[PDB]
Structures are given as structure tokens and as C-alpha cells.
Amino acid sequence: VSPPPPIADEPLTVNTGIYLIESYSLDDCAETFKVNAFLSLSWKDRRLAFDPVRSGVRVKTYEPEAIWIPEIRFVNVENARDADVVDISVSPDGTVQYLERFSARVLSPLDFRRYPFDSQTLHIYLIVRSVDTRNIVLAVDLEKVGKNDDVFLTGWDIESFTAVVKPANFALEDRLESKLDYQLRISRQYFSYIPNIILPMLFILFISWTAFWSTSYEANVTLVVSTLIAHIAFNILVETCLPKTPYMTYTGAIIFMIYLFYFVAVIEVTVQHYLKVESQPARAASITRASRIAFPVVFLLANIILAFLFF
Amino acid sequence: VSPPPPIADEPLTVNTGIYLIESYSLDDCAETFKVNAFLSLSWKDRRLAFDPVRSGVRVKTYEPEAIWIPEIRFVNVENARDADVVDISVSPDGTVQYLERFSARVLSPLDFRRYPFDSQTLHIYLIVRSVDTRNIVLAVDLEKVGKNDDVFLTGWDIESFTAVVKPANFALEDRLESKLDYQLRISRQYFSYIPNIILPMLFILFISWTAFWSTSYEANVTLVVSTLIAHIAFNILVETCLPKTPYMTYTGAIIFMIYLFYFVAVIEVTVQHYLKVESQPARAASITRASRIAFPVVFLLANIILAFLFF
Amino acid sequence: VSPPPPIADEPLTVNTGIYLIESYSLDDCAETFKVNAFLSLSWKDRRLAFDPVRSGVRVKTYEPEAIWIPEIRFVNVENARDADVVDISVSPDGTVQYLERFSARVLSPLDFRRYPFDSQTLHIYLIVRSVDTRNIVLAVDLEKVGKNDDVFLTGWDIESFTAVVKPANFALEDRLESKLDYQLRISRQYFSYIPNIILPMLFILFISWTAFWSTSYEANVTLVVSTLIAHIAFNILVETCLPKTPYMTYTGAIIFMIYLFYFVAVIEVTVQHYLKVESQPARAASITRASRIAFPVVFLLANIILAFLFF
Amino acid sequence: VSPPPPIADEPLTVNTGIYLIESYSLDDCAETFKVNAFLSLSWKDRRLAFDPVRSGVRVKTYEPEAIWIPEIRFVNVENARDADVVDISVSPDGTVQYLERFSARVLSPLDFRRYPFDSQTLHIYLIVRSVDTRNIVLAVDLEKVGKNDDVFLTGWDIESFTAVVKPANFALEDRLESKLDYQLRISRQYFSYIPNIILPMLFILFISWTAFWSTSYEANVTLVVSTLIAHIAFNILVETCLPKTPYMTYTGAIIFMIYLFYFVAVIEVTVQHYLKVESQPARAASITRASRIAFPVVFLLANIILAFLFF
Amino acid sequence: VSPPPPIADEPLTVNTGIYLIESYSLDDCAETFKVNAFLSLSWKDRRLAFDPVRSGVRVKTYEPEAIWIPEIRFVNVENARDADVVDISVSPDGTVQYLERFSARVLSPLDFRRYPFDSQTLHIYLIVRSVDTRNIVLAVDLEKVGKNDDVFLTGWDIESFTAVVKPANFALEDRLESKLDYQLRISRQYFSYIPNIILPMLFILFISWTAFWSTSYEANVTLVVSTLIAHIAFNILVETCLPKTPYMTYTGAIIFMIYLFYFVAVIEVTVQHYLKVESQPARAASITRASRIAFPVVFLLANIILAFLFF
Ligand SMILES: [Cl-]
Ligand SMILES: [Cl-]
Ligand SMILES: [Cl-]
Ligand SMILES: [Cl-]
Ligand SMILES: [Cl-]
């Protein structure tokens, strides 16, 4: 079968709808997520119009092979979606109501700048390519756009699932293409990061600052260097796959700062020891006493600056 | 072929049954489990009724293509099930007995609050979407619901496999959906956690408390900081992928408390040393002596409170 | 097509055979193994019997579609096997000789109690479900059961590949099922565990016992605590994915004992130091001197008890 | 069908085009990348020519089976591509315009010599094998070569996607092969390596150099050996799967140098201590004082030499 | 169709050829490698004979379905090769020339005894099972055996790709099988192991030997025990998945020896300290002085013995 002909020169409108049944496997490192949903399609085919009285039914059911069906695809998918046609209904005026259930792995970039206090807009791009006999344009049927109440993404809060009504019409490979943007907004559940990651990492850093209440060089070396090892080992324990970004992130800046702090603490411990050995205890004592305040104060200030710069 | 028509207006009843053959890959991180089972279906189609005397047969066998079959799907699956039709039998009255063997990856959320002493109810939701001509409703054949004796889930005790008899009937995209809840009750085998994880982790923490029987600051620094490293290294060794939860868990609270305890132990060691150096040994001695009791007592008390709050 | 009818009321016997070509990927954690083999099937169909006089051919070759073939499946597989029909031969009396080459991922539970000195019996369960007209029973053709000489399983010694001749006949989903048990006996190659894992782990433990020849508390703390870190780090290096078991294992008991030994060694080091500081060197000296013998002796004794208890 | 015959002795020209829709999974370890693209093909088959006036149509649409299609394959793919034919249009002169959407895993070697400041040229080799009746030659339509604006490779800057116009024509197994080289130029986003990896690794090395301002052998041993552990632990934390190369790399040379530096620092600490103990403090003091300058200077010089040799 | 009949009772010869296009993913742990190659087949089927004058063609082209094709399989594959048929050419005498491009994961055992200075012979076994009407025998067409110049295996040098001309003909399940051995000779690129693994590991061991130039027990304990931790941590950093072997390997022996050396160094440090404390400094001094030579000498000697025993 070939596409329905226009009455006049008009393009064929395909009314679309996506209804989320399941969302899962949001992979931060791959920048992908898996979706299981309904894809509803609607268009007019006058060749399928009938008289309900002379035919004996109010609705007609067809097998996909029996009628012409627009070839709809997703742009940002890894491999083509897994689809099962659920229903094909034709109304007296020739209106076709198509419904399929599909599953797909969607490629959608993420912004890590505010991780782990970030929000993301996931995109699902629907596309149709025009045929020789006529142009095909996509539209959104808002009554057929939504999500199941029990839809969840582990580690995320689902904000909304909507579609940008106006399609993007453009030329690709010498034909017109009609593209729709379906948007899934999510915000990361940051709660667990506080007791699990941030607080223990700060405790380890605070342990190193005890070296400012000790004049024992051997003990101070153990304090600063062993806490540095504990910090690295803790980071191995707690690490999750985050991809390499061409921009600076909030977490990246803090982590770099923590390393810088271990380094400066070694400098202080080295300087305090050298001055004592070189018969200058007054200088050594005033540097250590200032460090007791300078280290937590500079750390608190830098964090406020970073929090302000990123949020 | 379209669905069988009704006698009066009554909906078509599809009698369901799921029999577990294999259960495997219960992934705590992904909150999924794989299942290999039988799906039995039964309904009556009058258009299939025959005279056994004329036909010379008491039962008729059909290929799926030859007859109308209800489109049954699973709600909480990653991809649509891989199914192999085993048998289709039609009796003289038009009763169809359908049987398939299928494999599916099921998405079912887990409650980690009581991990590793948790129990879970895994769900397998069966669904049917109604058609234009008639409404399709699902029913449970509790007799045809079971599991093979050899069915095992590594690390779990399988309690029961059943279904909630009453289906959930609701509207979705202008059509009725009939949903059945099949429930697989499991409880975690916690035994191994005691010698493998809990006891060695406690031993490492108890080692740090020996610093309260020593006035050597250099030895105490090594004790507390090196045990903190041992704790982290031990946690790397025994870790399993638990996902990040928006709620506090029993294990999460304990682990945080263990870090807090290493931190407070450093504080004590720092304070005891500072008072000795600042010519106050009486204060330093009474703080260390109180710590010998305060540390195990507060630890035992906090654990009882947490165990009470979570169980 | 439909099954061959019986002459008298006798069930149809399907003579089976499995011949191993390749065995691989024995996954201890998943409790699965992959197999590549031949599945030979043989049964009698009188409708296919032909007179060798007015025909021409000695044996007739058929395509799977042309004739009735029993639906044979594996019980303990993840997904249905990938099979390629190699040959279908029909002899004058209607004896059908079927041959396929298949690959499958088999789910077979393992007993870890004696790991790494364990032996396992891997099972491949063949099954047939009976039909409306007649009952189907499985049998073993011993001349068609075996394995290729080159068959190897990395890390294991293949003892034998046999079948339990008597099938297990039972009811399931209102029909008779005939199940055969094919057994692949294997024993773990434990050799490498001795130089790679056991010996270095013992050396690390023996290092901690040197603390009984030293009265230096600072050195003893480093000895016991740093060896505990070395032990944990070594275990991270050599670990393999053994699953969590509801029973105690030989390795599990030894590893727990090693942790207990590090703990008791800290106790001793703590006690020896405390007694010296509390003007009791005689007691401290006799505890350390006894520990020099008590630690290796108790360790040797406990190991003998455990080895006896598990073997 | 067989290929269109030649008018004179000329080969059949197949005009090719590749348009990138998605690029993902650039695996440095496997030296592979996944691609989702359009493959456009164009050639003339005179047997397909028609009269538009008689036919009443200006374009003819065909199913792949109905007409002869050149067998185009990729050389450097893991498996054959997953392709979906989108369009086949025939114009009155017999010009065929073919379009498919495909996904493929491409094997393309990477040069690690300049990692992480490297640039790579990814190759996608298109090939056609000639037939008995006629020679098939590939051509590029650079207009039909491009990429979607949203195409991204995590951690890389996509510079260009082009084709080398001249195909490589050669004999293989007694037939002509026409090969086209499609090139995807990428350059690694090195920014993040500076704060995340290089700077913390240098800080850890600088900590070891503080041993040159201390005469305490116990503190110096801890400084050098504990920083060596911190360096190794840090490398475990921030590391990606680079494959083993038969050539020396920039990163490989630097990392080796860092280990050599830890070794020489131990030598210095050992020598300084030995001379002091052997009543030679003047020598010990001058070696340590020279090391304060020698270590950073030699490190800065060697890095300049390496940077010059590799860039 | 069925196989071509014999003129007399001669077997059917199938001339084979394998031409390597790509080789990749040599997995040491799984003992597998992936291959992308051409499989060329040639045999005579007189039923396909034609007169070039009548047909107007000197060569005929067929689709796989249209003619009888020998069922060729690989013995040592995981699943079955997935091939796409490239060409089928029949000459007037009925000589068929078949060509397919395939991809396959091949299971081929590796000898780790000499790792990482090892060489391997990878095998690809081609097989054909004979039929009732006639025996099928495999042959090698040497003009159709080879590899593309660009063929590479990351981490390996490809020496040669050849076939053992004489097939292995044997009986299996009452039928003849004709097996060919295709051999891919490779040698490991060991270069990178020298700066990346061997040299840093030796440096760490040499650091422990500095304890023989120090009488400080506390410093010596830190030296030997902390280097042991560095060694283990380094091994975690550089480790690759070698499988467990029932035989001793060169690398296995060296690694065991390194652990033994750390153990004996602790013994020495323990003995030296004990003798000093037990008023025997002369003995302690001569043991330490002998160790300065004994440790590097015994290490150099044992390595020479091991290198001789393994090479
Ligand atoms: Cl799609
Ligand atoms: Cl489903
Ligand atoms: Cl199966
Ligand atoms: Cl391809
Ligand atoms: Cl194969």
C-alpha cells in the first residue's frame, strides 16, 4: 500500500502521543536511559472511509499489513525501538487510531555542573520522513501524552513528561522530516550524599587539622599523610561513574580544593618543624596557632564562593 | 478474526495462571529479577465450537495465527517477554486452553530500610487492553499458580508465589485495562553477613578503642587513623551495589555512626594529648578513663535505638 | 501436522542423546555454565513408513516443517537454546532420526562448603510435554551420549558426562511431562590457590606474630594494624565472586578466624603494654612468651578441626 | 536479479553517502566506537527505466527484493550492521536512489603516544565486491556526507566528518574490490585532566620532597613510603582502561619517571641516614641540601625533554 | 534440496578457504578471540549444469535458497558464526563457487607458562557432517587462504595464518565428519610490561632492602610492612584477568617469590632486633651485613633459575 492522497496539496498530519509505563536504567556515564511506553498515532485515510449502516459496525479493526501505516522513528536511540502493535481502529470518516507498546534505550546528554544537586531535561525525539506522493507532518495530541502514576527512576524525582507542540520541520537527505521533542524532567535525589559521602569526607579532612594542636613532627606527618590515604581510599569506596566534562563542575572544584588543602597542611607541618629545628619556636608557634583558624575559615569561605558561583 | 461477541453485554473473561520454572539474577542495584515461567490462558470462543461426532475428534489443536488470541502483556518488564507457544487446545464448546513458556526481566522496586534483614514482595503485573467490540477482563486460576520445587534465588528464601484474585480494572487512553498482581514473597538470607561483614567491621572499630588505654600520642594516632583506613579498605572488600535511596536505611545509619565514632575518637586522642602538653594530666586521665566506658556504652545504646526505630 | 497415533494404547518413546562439543564460562557467582552440543532424537512414526520396493530411496530426508517433531526443551536454561537442525532421516519402518547442534546457558546450583577443594555435579534437564492424542516419554540412547576429547572447562577437571536412564514422569499444567537428568561431573583445580592465595595470606598473618618478640608498643601497633591492612588489601587483589550462602563454608570459617586472630593479637599487644605501664612487667612478659606458642598452636589446632569438620 | 549490463565496457558507479545521526561508546580499551547513521546509495539501472507519460507516474517505489541492489559492506566492523531500508526511488531514466538507516560497532585503532592531549582520525571503510558480468566502483557525493548538529562523543571534540574521494581499487580472491575511507576527526577534551589527575598527583610527589628538610629518619621513611602508597591509591581512583601499546607513550614515560623519583628519594633518605650514623654529618647535610634543588630541577627538566620528544 | 549424487560412489569434496579481514578481542581470561573473515566454499553439483549458448551467460548466479549448500560449521565457536552470503557462482559444469563474510567468537585454549613473553597458536576448526546419500570431505584451496595486511590484534604480533591441508576424517554418531584446522600464530607484545609493571614492582621490593642499612626497629617495621602494602596496592593497579591454571607459570613463581622475600625480610628485621635486645649486637650486625648481599644475590640467582626452567 501507498500513502493516502491529498484532497488539495496539503501534507498528511500524524497526531502523536507517548504515554510512559516504565522508565529505568538512567546511566550517568553513558548518558542514556531506558523507556517502556505506548506510542499512539492518528491520521486520516479517505480510502478507509465507510458507511456504518451498510457495513454493519461502528469501528473497523485492521492488521498492520492490510493498511498503510506511517514509518515513525526515534532520532536519539541506540538501536531501533522494540515495538508490538496493540490496536489499529478505523472510524467511519477514515480516521485511523494506531497504538503500539515499545521499549527503547535513549541517548540524551546530561549537565554535571551542579551534580549531585542537579536537574535534567531528558529528550525523546520523534521523527517522520516524507514520501514521494506526499509530505508527512507530526502533531501532538495532548490528551494522549502522559505517564503512569507508579513511574519511577531510581535515584531521581520525576517532575513532568510533556511534548513541545510545534514540530521542527527541515530537509534531510533530499526530503522533508518532521521532528517532535518529548521532554522528561528529572531532579536528582541528593539526600543520601549527605550522610554517605559528604559528612565522612569532611570528617577525614577535619582529622588532618588536628596537626595544628601538635608539635610532634612524626605524629603530624602520620596525621596529614594517613588522612590523605584515607580520603583517596574513601573516594574509591564511594565513587560512581561520572563522565569527563570539558567544563568545571561543583564537585570537581570541591574535590580539587580538598587535595590542595592536604598539600597546604603538609606545607604548614613542614614549615612548623623546620623553624623549631632552626631555633625559631616563636614563628613556628604563631604559624600553627593561625592555621587553627585559617584552615576552617578559608575552607568555609571558599565553599560559600563555590556554592554561589555554581548556584 | 476479531474477538468473540457477547451473548448479553458481559465482558470476556481470560483465566490466567503463572507457573515459575526458573528465577534468577535478582539485581539489588537495578531492582530487577529474571524469570522463566509458563503462562496459561483460558477463555471460550463460540465461533470455535464443533460437533465431536461429525468431526470424529474430541479436541482440536490450532496454530496461534489460525485463531483469535487475547493480547496479554506484562506491565513492569524491561522489554516484551520472549514467548514460545507450547499448546493451543479447543474443546467442543469452544473453550480455548492456551499455554506458553516465557522469559522476562521484571522491574520491581525494593525496600532497603531493613537491609540486610529485609523481606521483599516482588510483583509481576499481567495486563489486557479491551477492544472496540468488547471488554476483556482477567481472572486468577489460583490452582494454576505455582512454582517448581528447584526454584531458587541465590541469597534469598522463597516464601510464596501467588496472585491477588481481584484484578484492577481502570481506564487508560479511552479503553479499559484489566491488571492482575502476581506476588513473589522473598526474605533475605542474612546469616553470612554476621561472620563475613558485621563481626570483622566491629573488631576493626574495637581496635581503635584501645587508644583509651594508652597515653602515647604517636601510637594513638596510628591506632585511630590506621583503623579508619582498615575500615574503609574492609568496606571496599565486602561492598555490594545497593542503590542510593531517598530515605534513611538501618545499614546507612550504622555506617554513618561508625565514621562519626572514628572522628570523635580522634577528638578524644587530640584532647588527651593537648591537656598533657598544657600541664593538665588529671583532666586528660579522667577523659581517657571515661572514654573506656562512654565509647562502648554509647555505641551499644545507639545501636539499640536504631534497631528499635527500624524493626 | 499432528503426533503419530498408537497401535495399541502405548506412549510415544523419544530416544534422546546429548554429545558435548564445547563447555565454557562456568560462572561461580551466577551458578551458570555454557554448553555447545548435539541433541539427537529418535522415535517411530508409522505414517512415515514406506515400502522399499516401489519407492527408490534407502533413507528419506525431510525438512522440519514437512513432518511432526516432538517439542523438546531444557528446564534449567536462562533463555531457550539456540538450535540448528543438522539432519532428519526416516528409515523404512518409519523410524525418525533427528539431529541438531545447540548452544545454551544452563542454570545449575553449586555447593561452596568445600571451596576451593570442591566437586560439582552440573545438571542439564531435558523435558517433553505430552499432547492431546498421546503421551510422550523420554528415553536415553547410551550410544549417543558422550563428549569430545578436547572438551575442557577452565579451572576444572571434567570427570564424566552421563545421563540418569530412568526419566522423571510427573503432572504439570494438567499434562504429563517426561524429564531426563544429564549429569556433568567436575572437580575444581585447586593447585594455584596454594602459591597464589593461601601461602601469601599466611605469611601476612605470621608477620603479625612477630609482635610477641617485641616490647615496643609503637612498633607492635604498626605490626598488627598494618598487617591487618595488608591482609584486607591482599584479599581485594585475589578475590573472586563467590555468592552469599545460607550455610557456613570452609573458606568462610578460615577467613573469619584470620580476622579474629588479628583482633586477639591487638588485645595481647594492648594488655602487654598496659601491664608494663602499670608496673607489672612479670605478667606482661609471661603473656607475650605464652602468645609465641599459643598463637601458632591454636591456629594449627583450629585449622585441623575445621578441615576435619568440612572433609 | 543480476547487475545492470554495461553499454560500453565501463564499470558500474555506486554513489555513496554517510550522514551521522548518533555517535557513542568510544571505547579507548577496545579501540571501538558505535555509530547510528544513514547510508545513501545511488546508481542507474536501465532495465528499470520507464515512460512517465504511459505510467502516469514520475517516480516508482520498490521493495528491496523486487530490484537488484549492490551488496555494500563495512570492512572494519565487529558484526555486519543492523540496517533498515528507509527508501528506494526509481526515476524515468532508471536512476535508483537508495536510503537506509544503520547502526554499527566500528573497529578503529587509536594512537596513544600523546594521550591525554591526543587527536584521532576514526575510519569507516565502505566496500563493494565486483561480479562476473561487471565491475562495481564506489564514489562519494560530499554533499551527502555530513553529521547531525547534536552528534557528540563524551570526552571529545568532533572536528569533522568527511570522505577521501578517491576509492582504493584492488584485487582480492580473483575479483575487484572498491573501498572508500570515511574519516571522523576527533580531539580529546584534556581540560579535566589538569585539576582531576595531574595536579593532585604532583601534590603527592611534592609531599615526598619535604623529606629533604628533615633529618628524622622515621619521619622521612613515613613521608616517602606513605606518599608512594598515596600515589598508587590515587592512580587506582582516577584511571581509565588504556590498552597495552608496543610503543612508549607520553603518560607512560611520566608515570615511570614518578616511580623512579620515589625510588631515588628512598635512596637519598637511606644515604642521608647512613652517613649520619657513620659519623659523617657534613656529607649527609650537603646531599640533602642539594636534593632540595636537584629533585624539582631534574623533574622540571625531564618533563620539558619528554614534552619536546612527544610534541 | 538434497546433496548432488555420485557418478561412482566417490565422496563430495568441499574446497574451503578462510581469508581474515579483522581479528579482535583476544580475551585471556575467557580464552576466546573474535574474527571477521571470508569463508569461501567450492564443490560440484552437476544438477546445476547449463549450456552457456542457450542461457546467454558464461556464469550463473543463485540465491542460497535456490540450490543445495553444504552445512559447514565451526567446532570451537561459542554460538554459531553469523554470515551474510556475498556470492554464489555456478560454471557450465556445475562447479559452484560460494562466498560468505562471517563474524565469530572462537574458543581456543592458551598456554600461560611463559606469560608475558608467550606465543600462542589459535585454532579455527571447520567441520562438515556426511549425509545418507553421500560422504562429504573437506579440502583446502591454498590460493583462497590468507589475511588482510591491516589485520591486527591489540597487544599481539600476528605471525601467520595457515591451514593444515590434510583434514581429520573420523566417525561420530554413525556418520563421517571431515574436520580442517586453520591456525593463527601470535606472539605477545611484552614491551610495555617492562616500564609499566616489572620495573616499579622491583623498585618497591628494593625499598624494603634498605632496612639492612638501619638498626631502627620502628623504621624497619614501617619499611618492610609499608612496602608490602605498596606491592599489593601496585598489583591491584596493574592486574589483568589471567585465568587459574593447573600448572605453575613463570609470573606465578616470581610473584610468589616476591611475597616470600617480604616475609624473610620481616624475619631478618625481627631477628636483628631480638639479638640487640638480648645483648648480642655482634650477631645482629653480621646478619644485617650479610643480608645486604644475600637478598639481592639470592633474588638474582632464583630469577636466573626460573628464567632457565621456563625458557
Ligand atoms: Cl525507533
Ligand atoms: Cl510482555
Ligand atoms: Cl530449550
Ligand atoms: Cl556491514
Ligand atoms: Cl558455525
GROMACS .gro file of C-alpha atoms and ligand atoms in nm, chain E residues 72-74 77 79-81, ligand 5:
model
    8
 1316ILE     CA    1   2.964  -2.614   0.723
 1317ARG     CA    2   3.011  -2.536   1.090
 1318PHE     CA    3   3.290  -2.434   1.326
 1321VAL     CA    4   3.271  -2.143   1.850
 1323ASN     CA    5   2.740  -1.956   1.936
 1324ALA     CA    6   2.738  -2.009   1.559
 1325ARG     CA    7   2.911  -1.776   1.308
 1560CL      CL    8   2.938  -2.207   1.271
   0.00000   0.00000   0.00000
